[PDB]
Write a protein that binds this ligand. Structure first.
Ligand code: L7N
Ligand code: OJQ
Ligand code: CA
Ligand code: CL
Ligand code: CL
Ligand code: CL
Lengths: 371, 373
């Protein structure tokens, strides 16, 4: 292969087992939206379920239907629905739907009547993010509609959910505030004669660092992929599952004073040897990494030199060569062999590793190492 | 009923190709459609460019060429980036032109000619200063002697000499003239050794539009085909950006002064206002670093992003004025600018990159669609 994003399903399994230890008695919903954060939703889901995850979480019904089409029968919850969605296919495919407004509930109920299939409903409430959750003042009307719908077997009241303002800051008191607001939502439900089967608030950071805030289920995403939910703490016992690598396509001699790549932004201070790596920013190698990233080749760090192009970049091998055409360059991975990590890229680019792992594409073929 | 789309206006593609052809003068035009047409769709852009006067197509890899051929493209296609040890046989059998950048690569190609019995239509990619891949002056004489023997037995047709410019976006710089002179030197070496190339090409979009004095037999523009200016400091250069990225407004909501929005509450409302949720994010190619910087166009008005861009969504501020946005309305993230929307260059400026990277970013939920010419 020209380049690959190898997903170690053994690491996925390890991470899920670590998360289950932190979750204690709470069931685990593995979040595999965005094609498993770039790792492959279906393969990650299968591995996570086999390692004891109880359920799957995705953003869209489309993502849930793709899992269903691949043979996944485990519970799948979808929580982001565009205007105009037809909930009918979700119902016929036994996809759970989280509603975040009375309009969405009414839409879902019309679909229940049309398909004849009871909806397994979760309600998504806002406890601070201020995105699409139902707000406190609108919750009672939703409870009343839900209770009436439940009283005619139109819905099963499965879940109450909300999402944390901090993905990476377990010590901030907004975590505590959100949990208290969540408890207050549950008290509202009680006052309106409504009981949810399960309630869940926790992302990876809360699961691993705020077990005192865990409700009935946890909903980890980033930690399933082995990426630290609190980077300042280190790897938190997780193993990043994605390794991005590519073959050395060319080894070329350069004389001192020669410029390299567009604009000649790098000029060789010495006679040296370069490696051409045939992936670039159209493949997810952020152009801002130019002149800052390093790769690992035959156990040695080799720094990028010159601009990242659309489909290639150069690294400096130094001055007799220990690298041949066809040898493997590791761009990032768990770090086991000394390679950079997704967090290293995030630091260089000014982003977070979530964005790093949803970047590889194009010539970077996704592959799998079995557990 | 798409949640989001990258709408490619093929009438813009046609316009841009006709503009490039005018600038090309006496030269023919090879449309560069690598990286899936710079994210615009290699096959659809290729078909349009060919109908608007493009003579040939250029891609990086044989794989890209084979995808065009599989889609029914029969026009000339040149591929110029090959991994070591490639089997060139499939390229030969699919009538893919091959640019070689080393003597070793020529040997691989001739080995494939021997195995398949199919003549290779060869271009030599020479190094005139980029120092990436390309045959250097030291190796070119040996290359010519080898090509002459291969041509004599009809193992190769010697189609092309090519090189690539160090500056994609600065036509005035003297290195452009230096590279053109080095390129002429390669051509003169070939002529003196009795090796005739049918065509020579050096010009990218920048050179094609701004340095007609440096044009050889073909020009090889990419970025300007997609309407993106090859010299941003000169403006749109008469081109029309062909990609419009847009999405449906998923939610409109009011918020109160003092409330934070999105992860980390990095934006706190200074006043009561209305927000819209746009259901695409950085996994769809909306660079996270756009957060708190970008604006979108909704019903003719600029609406700034507020709070962090999430994996699959972000919020924009509609303001506290009379609400003129409904769920299901169209929000334009970038486009040619005709309606006052931001451009890809605007994104490039905000995040510190180039529009080349902007247009190869949209993906995921952003479905590629086409408006016919
Ligand atoms: C051999 C060759 N010839 C013409 C073009 C077309 O170049 P542009 O007209 O400037 O788009 C390209 C494309 N180069 C891409 C652009 O971004 N970075 C790159 O490496 C090319 O590799
Ligand atoms: C409803 C819901 N529940 C759990 C998780 C899992 O969160 P995490 O453990 O931090 O990966 C997410 C993921 N949210 C994001 C990741 O990147 N941008 C985002 O908006 C989520 O939307
Ligand atoms: Ca409307
Ligand atoms: Cl959501
Ligand atoms: Cl929310
Ligand atoms: Cl050579």
């Amino acid at each position: 292969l020209l380049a690959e994003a190898m997903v170690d399903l053994g690491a996925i399994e390890h991470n899920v087992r670590v998360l289950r230890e932190h979750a204690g008695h709470a069931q685990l919903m593995a979040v595999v939206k965005a094609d498993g954060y770039g790792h492959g939703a279906t393969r990650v889901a299968q591995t996570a379920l086999g390692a004891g995850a109880a359920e799957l979480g995705v953003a869209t019904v489309d993502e849930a239907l793709a899992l269903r089409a691949d043979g996944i029968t485990a519970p799948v919850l979808a929580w982001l629905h565009p205007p105009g969605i037809d909930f009918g296919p979700a119902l016929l495919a036994d996809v759970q739907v989280a509603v975040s407004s009375l309009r969405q509930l009414d839409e879902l109920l019309h679909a229940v009547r049309r398909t004849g299939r009871t909806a397994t409903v979760t309600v998504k409430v806002d406890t601070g993010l201020n995105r699409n959750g139902v707000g406190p003042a609108q919750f009672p009307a939703m409870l009343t509609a839900l209770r009436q719908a439940m009283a005619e077997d139109a819905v099963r009241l499965r879940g109450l959910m909300s999402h944390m303002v901090y993905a990476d800051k377990p010590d901030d008191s907004i975590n505590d505030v959100q949990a208290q607001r969540f408890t207050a939502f549950l008290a509202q439900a009680r006052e309106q004669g409504v009981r949810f089967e399960v309630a869940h608030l926790s992302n990876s950071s809360a699961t691993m660092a705020r077990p005192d805030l865990t409700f009935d289920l946890v909903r980890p995403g980033i930690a399933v992929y082995g990426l630290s939910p609190v980077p300042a703490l280190g790897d938190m016992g997780l193993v990043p599952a994605m390794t991005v690598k590519c073959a050395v396509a060319l080894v070329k001699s350069i004389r001192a004073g020669e410029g390299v790549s567009y604009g000649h932004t790098w000029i060789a201070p010495r006679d040296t040897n370069l490696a051409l790596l045939p992936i670039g920013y159209a493949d997810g190698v952020f152009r801002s990494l130019g002149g800052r990233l390093e790769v690992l080749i035959n156990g040695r760090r080799c720094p990028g030199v010159g601009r990242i192009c659309m489909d290639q970049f150069m690294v400096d091998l130094g001055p007799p060569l220990d690298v041949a055409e066809g040898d493997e360059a590791i761009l990032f991975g768990p770090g086991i062999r000394g390679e950079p990590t997704a967090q290293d890229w995030a630091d260089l680019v000014g982003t977070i590793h979530y964005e790093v792992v949803t970047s590889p594409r194009g010539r970077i073929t996704r592959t799998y190492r079995e557990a």
